Amino acid sequence: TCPFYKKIPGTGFTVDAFQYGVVEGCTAYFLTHFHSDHYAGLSKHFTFPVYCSEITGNLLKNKLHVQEQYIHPLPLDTECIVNGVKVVLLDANHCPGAVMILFYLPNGTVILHTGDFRADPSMERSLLADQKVHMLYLDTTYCSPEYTFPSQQEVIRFAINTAFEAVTLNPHALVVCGTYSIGKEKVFLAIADVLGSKVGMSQEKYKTLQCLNIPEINSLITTDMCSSLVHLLPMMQINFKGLQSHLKKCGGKYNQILAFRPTGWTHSNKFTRIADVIPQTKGNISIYGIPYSEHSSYLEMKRFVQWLKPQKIIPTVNVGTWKSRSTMEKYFREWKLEAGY
Ligand code: NI
Numbered sequence: 001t002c003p004f005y006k007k008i009p010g011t012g013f014t015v016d017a018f019q020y021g022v023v024e025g026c027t028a029y030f031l032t033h034f035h036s037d038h039y040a041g042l043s044k045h046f047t048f049p050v051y052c053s054e055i056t057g058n059l060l061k062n063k064l065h066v067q068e069q070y071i072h073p074l075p076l077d078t079e080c081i082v083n084g085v086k087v088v089l090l091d092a093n094h095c096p097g098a099v100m101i102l103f104y105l106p107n108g109t110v111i112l113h114t115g116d117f118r119a120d121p122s123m124e125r126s127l128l129a130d131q132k133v134h135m136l137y138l139d140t141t142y143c144s145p146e147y148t149f150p151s152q153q154e155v156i157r158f159a160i161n162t163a164f165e166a167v168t169l170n171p172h173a174l175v176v177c178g179t180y181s182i183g184k185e186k187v188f189l190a191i192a193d194v195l196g197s198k199v200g201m202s203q204e205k206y207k208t209l210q211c212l213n214i215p216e217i218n219s220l221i222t223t224d225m226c227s228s229l230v231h232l233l234p235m236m237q238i239n240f241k242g243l244q245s246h247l248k249k250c251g252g253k254y255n256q257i258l259a260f261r262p263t264g265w266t267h268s269n270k271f272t273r274i275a276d277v278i279p280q281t282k283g284n285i286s287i288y289g290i291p292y293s294e295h296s297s298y299l300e301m302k303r304f305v306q307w308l309k310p311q312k313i314i315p316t317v318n319v320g321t322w323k324s325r326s327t328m329e330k331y332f333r334e335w336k337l338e339a340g341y
Helices: 054-062 121-125 152-169 185-194 203-210 240-248 298-308 322-339
Strands: 013-015 028-030 050-052 071-073 080-082 085-091 099-104 110-113 135-138 173-179 230-234 256-263 280-282 285-291 312-315
Touching (some): 050 054, 121 298, 135 298, 230 240, 240 285
Parallel strands (some): 013 028, 028 050, 110 135, 173 256
Antiparallel strands (some): 080 085, 085 099
């Protein structure tokens, strides 16, 4: 059944709750972003109102075939009335189209639901600065002090420098980047840009990218693989067997592959810096795992919450085990005692 942490009290609303059938008492289903664990259950047969961003709305229509009459896109940073309740959508700094949602309950309670987010100090100057938030439904993916990772900017700088050096030394090297969802487009776009190439990809993935309102996108991507020296493949194909295979397919146009696997966290983050990362190499194939995250580090999460000073925190991630739930509740109490709310 629908868990309590997907329901908004005092409303008939649910958030990211599409896999339970009809939720008794739900008048509006919000969708924070287009990632499969969140939209799971949506299809062309859905006949309830879906509220989301413009970009998420484009993907629901074009990829899932949800009918236009049930898709309700809202602009960001704008007070909107839904079924009698004032709501605002804010940028979540996650993947394209990902939002946080502010609910203003008739009784005066204000609730923030972060969806999936990467906390950033820029959020401290949004419409969140303007009133008190009582309850926070928080993305706790990386809520443990071991989770450090570099800035997105530092990671893209490393990738750009690595690729440009490799291809300039060997003009017959291919760059491959893995993907299994929307998000982390900066990785492959930044590399293609420094190399003066477009990125080549399958027809299904091109279709997905043409939903994202990225400026000048026609100038940056293509379905013609042969004209391109940055290829995107399924994350599953990013290994030596999949890459050797792929290399055969290019007809001896290339003699070397340099591949990137944008992971979340991996335990080499506890010991190694970005300047010190090394690949796995078999022959003329090298694979780099780069820690490009679209979720809060522990310190970014802690800063956001200590800024916001909520009265109650409801975790939405890692909630399945008593050990995880207890650990999280300990950090929340530390933060509150250190900051004095
Ligand atoms: Ni996500």
